Amino acid sequence: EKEILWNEAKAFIAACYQELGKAAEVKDRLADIKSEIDLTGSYVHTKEELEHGAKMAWRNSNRCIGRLFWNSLNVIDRRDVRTKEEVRDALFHHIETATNNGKIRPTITIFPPEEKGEKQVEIWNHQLIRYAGYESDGERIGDPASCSLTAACEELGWRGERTDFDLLPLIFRMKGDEQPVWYELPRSLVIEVPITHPDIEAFSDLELKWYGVPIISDMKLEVGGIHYNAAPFNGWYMGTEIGARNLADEKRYDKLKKVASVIGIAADYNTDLWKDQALVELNKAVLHSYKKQGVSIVDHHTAASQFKRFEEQAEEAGRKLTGDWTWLIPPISPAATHIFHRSYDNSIVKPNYFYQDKPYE
Amino acid sequence: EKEILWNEAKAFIAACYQELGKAAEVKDRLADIKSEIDLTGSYVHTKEELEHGAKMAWRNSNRCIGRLFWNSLNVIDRRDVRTKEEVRDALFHHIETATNNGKIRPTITIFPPEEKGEKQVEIWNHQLIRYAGYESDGERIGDPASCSLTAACEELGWRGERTDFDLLPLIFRMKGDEQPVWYELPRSLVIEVPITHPDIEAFSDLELKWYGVPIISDMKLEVGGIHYNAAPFNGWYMGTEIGARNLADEKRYDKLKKVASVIGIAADYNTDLWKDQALVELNKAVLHSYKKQGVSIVDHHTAASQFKRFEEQAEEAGRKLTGDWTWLIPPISPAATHIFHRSYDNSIVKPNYFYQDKPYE
């Protein structure tokens, strides 16, 4: 266990300090760490290490098209929190600062890491801002992806209004508590964007909306053998995540048939490509709506052009590029991007963000 | 060498005869084959084996979405050919019978297999029907994918008219000849489809067309250790191959900017998703045009629904399914198909079709 930790620490510190121009400081820092492990079973990252590790982890995320901006990640160090009111307030603050009145700042808030594999803080939310979903007899309301978390919140005394867009409460558990606690999101903190279309007036009849900032809160950040299981982060949306998946997937909001109706085309024949046409108009609407409201968003073409620059930058820096082609291609017109036409090495490099088991389900 | 052949033969004959309900005939057939190899260095497939192997090979082609119809493949046995006039006439016949006045019959014509690794017939064409491509000083004409074969044909005394749609001649080489021969395609054999749009009259201004039948002629069919390096086959097109790739790719005909102009939208801003919209209209046009002319074609949604039935049929038959997710997803709206949302085992099972080195380049 100390072995695993010490090895990961050596590899991380060497790489981190080398990138920071601090290679001469490695030996002594490794000494102090070597001693810290032996005596304590673990080690504490300096603020520099933690900030740079979170950035490296984003840089190494094979499935992320948005990596060009890895080095400008805003890292908030909240390893000092000890109470659920502090965790709540840190989560609220992250929402406010990341949102930044619509000019989204990619941000991560880092909570105390696991100790003996024992979590200090365990966040139940998949994103800090997400819509509830309900499925009783016949009745399908809200986001189906949220059905199991929604049902767990309602087990704890929360009750949703059962609109298609109920905001789930924040829900997390403190070490030593048997049950999580939940806190309703202050609506003043949550920017939402009504979906309208630039040319088609009737599009507002769909009464679609989405929230401004995706803040993924259920992954584990690993840096130098330290497991930060609670470390929510956000970028800005790529439009297709909303228009081609959240609002379009049959198992999510399933809106293509309704889009086809409001844009005035038939939804009767596959050869009419009505789904494709509906997708393009819905995705135009999403980009238009976010831009009109002054909320950051990127389209999949601009995003892919940025990712090409990330590839070029990787090569120029002497770093291997890794990537997961199946996740990097956009779900709309993928062959119109350069990503589609090359292959990527899907190797896992640490620091990195990882999946971890849900505590509901 | 005999070892490799004999092993592949045992595996193929057992599987083939089992599927044909002829399991009791295996032992004796294996005996005759065992003897045939020892005495001759090779073995000759019965007509049943060859027909069933070509069908199995299609069934095992991981990258093919059209596999539902594997068992109805029309197999033409041309292992009897010895002269270049016979090969020419067999290739002409394949075009005529596969085209079938627009009601395309999936067909394969099988030529004599390699003997000592020595080819009896070597087809240079990538497809029997394809357009030439030219690239001299600044000037880009026709299909860039055809530039190297076009240049090789012109080395042999062929001359293209240098339209954007010159039909390449058939070109192949006989064992014992140093150079291939080439034969102009009779225009009466080649169905072409002018691309028009159902709603947008101006679309014909683009003067786009494509040929009716893709007849892939440069892959190797392997069956029971026998290498049929010359075995051209065809299905019908899936519309996206023409509309999303052949006519759309920057390195192919690169028509999206011109499509955007004729459909009356600006091609200035990525956030307008003009490429996506152009793709959808071009792909609607392709499907419409083939249907209007009575030439077989499938759209990517219908095709994916058929592939779902192929998956179900595989399971019901007790056969492992294999597939290459990266090639099975359509290049237009892939997340609208079930294919996108599952994974596939990309293992290689024989019989199968394989890439082989070009003899030009």
Ligand code: HEM
């Ligand atoms: C700056 C804006 C950003 C954009 C536009 C962007 C875009 C994307 C997209 C579209 C995906 C695919 C999501 C899916 O299909 O479910 C993704 C995956 C990912 N992104 Fe980014 N991203 C951004 C910033 C970030 C940041 C700041 C981090 C972390 C510090 C991050 C880490 C990841 C990770 C870990 C995944 C993979 C998640 C998984 O395996 O399920 N991204 N990104």
Ligand code: HEM
């Ligand atoms: C019946 C109509 C058929 C349709 C609609 C169809 C559809 C497709 C498509 C769209 C591809 C991908 C091509 C690309 O992206 O370049 C493909 C690949 C393939 N198909 Fe089919 N196909 C059909 C029939 C056949 C037949 C009859 C065979 C052989 C007997 C075949 C064997 C293959 C093979 C080997 C590939 C992979 C080629 C490679 O690796 O480059 N298909 N098919």
Ligand SMILES: CNCc1cccc(OCc2ccc3ccc(N)nc3c2)c1
């Ligand atoms: C439950 N859906 C799968 C799943 C599980 C865990 C994390 C995750 O993250 C997707 C993800 C992660 C980071 C992102 C950053 C920016 C962005 N626009 N999308 C992003 C999307 C997705």
Ligand SMILES: CNCc1cccc(OCc2ccc3ccc(N)nc3c2)c1
């Ligand atoms: C040169 N492009 C790559 C390359 C090399 C060799 C074969 C090949 O075949 C693609 C292919 C093969 C069979 C097909 C059958 C039907 C169809 N509609 N498309 C089909 C497309 C593609």
Ligand SMILES: C[C@H](O)[C@H](O)[C@H]1CNc2nc(N)[nH]c(=O)c2N1
């Ligand atoms: C090598 C690279 O992944 C390449 O662009 C592949 C991707 N998927 C594909 N899928 C299909 N159907 N056809 C192709 O030509 C390709 N090209």
Ligand SMILES: C[C@H](O)[C@H](O)[C@H]1CNc2nc(N)[nH]c(=O)c2N1
């Ligand atoms: C497992 C299966 O391949 C799955 O549908 C993947 C495919 N590629 C993807 N790509 C992105 N960007 N997001 C996803 O959720 C998925 N899902």
Ligand SMILES: [Cl-]
């Ligand atoms: Cl999302």
Ligand SMILES: [Cl-]
């Ligand atoms: Cl083609």
